[PDB]
Structure 1
Amino acid sequence: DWEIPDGQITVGQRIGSGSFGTVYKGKWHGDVAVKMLNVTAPTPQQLQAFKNEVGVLRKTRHVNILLFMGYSTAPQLAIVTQWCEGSSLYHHLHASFEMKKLIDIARQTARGMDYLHAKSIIHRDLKSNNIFLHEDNTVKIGDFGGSILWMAPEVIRNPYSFQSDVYAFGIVLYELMTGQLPYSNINNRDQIIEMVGRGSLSPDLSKVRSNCPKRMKRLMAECLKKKRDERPSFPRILAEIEELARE
């Protein structure tokens, strides 16, 4: 069992919030990250609901997948993981790399994503802010345990699939290769939701830089396919990036 008894974790600085819960930095045999679930008091039925989600995190052992370390039931429900120094991929790309590094970041993410799907785990919300650059070198994918820019057309209108995860990866590719989010010119949610859902809108690939491996863009566009079944699986995506990487 991976339950961490009450009192063992010293919760510190509040880092940020989300629909799910609040993230703090903590102390448990060194630095940890504690996600306080937005649940004052847990019902026995909520308790099982929690265990089921932990049982899914329980089967993630990979260097590119955020390290799940433990879970709390008291005081309140919480997920304990490793502490990632630096910032999210979002903060680097948009808030504050060499083309080689960009590929590496893109490469590690595929490793993590392929591992997850091999474990038959659909992230369901892959985006640059759920990708943490620990030490600014290693990629840590979390929050698989709002943002519509990474949502596949079939998701907007078995909606959630490995293939919709692939699309979210394509957008991530777009972030890396352009250094900016899709539909930046169009700052209207309902507009993007309406236009991408019907197939009239797609990321502008004229933004990618010349110094972008044009083996990538083919792959990017392959993952950004409007049609679900026209997308390559992650094994393919991994092999591809790995093969176009050797250079």
Structure 2
Amino acid sequence: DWEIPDGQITVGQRIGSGSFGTVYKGKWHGDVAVKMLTPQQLQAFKNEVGVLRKTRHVNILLFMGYSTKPQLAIVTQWCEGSSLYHHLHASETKFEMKKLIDIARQTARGMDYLHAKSIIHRDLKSNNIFLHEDNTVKIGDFGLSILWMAPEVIRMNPYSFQSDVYAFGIVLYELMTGQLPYSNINNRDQIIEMVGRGSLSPDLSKVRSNCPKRMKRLMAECLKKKRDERPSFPRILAEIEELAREL
């Protein structure tokens, strides 16, 4: 069992807070993150712990334990650095194509793993891909998001391995263009209607000129409106892993 008895974790700096939990930096045999949940959100707690326990993979945020006294707390490793989102869209940081692809490859490894464990992420986006120490991808759920929704998710079960695939295609888009899709649509409501209705889809011409042919192909395959035309992560992982053998 992975329960951590009361009194063992030293709870430090409050890191961020939301409708569904508050996260602190912690000390428990070194640095951890501690996510506090209110007593009323027990079910959420069990469900989040339930999925985290199912995972042991270098590109997934490492689950370490939980506490029921005196609070509902989830304990993960601590990551240093910032979200892929922050790297791509908030910092003049322009990655090299080799680095971009390596990020794609690691994200794909993580997502491939999650699906192998029968886990649909449901909320994949660049805000949830942590660049631990600038190098290693840690996929988790850091939320406490329409841009990454498949048309079928938009329309309102809509969540599948293939809706995850689509979100990942949108991550690919960000990596390959540096931008977010639909940057030219000032209206969130418009994006929801048009993407749902079929009317709207990302402009793939916005990609870097040094973007690999195999990657533009892949991206577009991940973004297919009919979810059954989208490829699975083993294929995706294999095409990327092949592509990265451009060394």
Assess same fold via TM > 0.5: yes
Q: Is the Cα–Cα contact under 8 Å of residues 57 and 145 in structure 1 kept in the other structure?
A: no
Indicate the residue corresponding to 1:11 in structure 2. 11
TM-score by length of 2: 0.93
Deviates more, 1:59-68 or 1:14-23: 14-23
Q: Is the Cα–Cα contact under 8 Å of residues 127 and 142 in structure 2 kept in the other structure?
A: no
Aligned partners of 2:175, 2:203: CA distance in 1, in Å? Answer: 13
Indicate the residue corresponding to 2:205 in structure 1. 206
Deviations 1:108-146 (A, max 9, x none): 000000000000100000000111000100000001899
Change (3 A) 1:180 1:87: same
Q: Is the Cα–Cα contact under 8 Å of residues 53 and 145 in structure 1 kept in the other structure?
A: no
SS of the residue 2:146 aligns to: coil
Change (3 A) 1:45 1:95: closer
> Cα distance, 1:11 vs. partner?
1.4
**Percent of aligned pairs sharing the same letter:** 99
Structure 2 residue ranges without an equivalent (≥5): none
Indicate the residue corresponding to 1:145 in structure 2. 143
Change (3 A) 1:29 1:147: same
Q: Is the Cα–Cα contact under 8 Å of residues 153 and 198 in structure 1 kept in the other structure?
A: yes
SS of the residue 1:86 aligns to: coil
Deviates more, 1:213-222 or 1:136-145: 136-145
Aligned partners of 1:136, 1:44: CA distance in 2, in Å? Answer: 35
Q: Is the Cα–Cα contact under 8 Å of residues 24 and 33 in structure 1 kept in the other structure?
A: yes
> Cα distance, 1:89 vs. partner?
0.5
Q: Is the Cα–Cα contact under 8 Å of residues 22 and 144 in structure 2 kept in the other structure?
A: no
Aligned partners of 1:145, 1:112: CA distance in 2, in Å? Answer: 18
Change (3 A) 1:146 1:203: farther
Change (3 A) 1:34 1:45: closer
Q: Is the Cα–Cα contact under 8 Å of residues 54 and 145 in structure 1 kept in the other structure?
A: no
TM-score by length of 1: 0.93
> Cα distance, 1:46 vs. partner?
5.5
Aligned partners of 2:225, 2:63: CA distance in 1, in Å? Answer: 34
Q: 2:71 aligns with which of 72, 76, 83?
A: 76
> Cα distance, 1:184 vs. partner?
0.7
| Off by >6 Å, runs of 4+ in structure 1 | none
Change (3 A) 1:213 1:90: same
> Cα distance, 1:54 vs. partner?
1.4
Change (3 A) 1:244 1:77: same
SS of the residue 1:55 aligns to: helix
CA RMSD, Structure 1 to Structure 2 (Å): 1.9
Deviations 1:66-110 (A, max 9, x none): 100111212221211011111110110011110000000010000
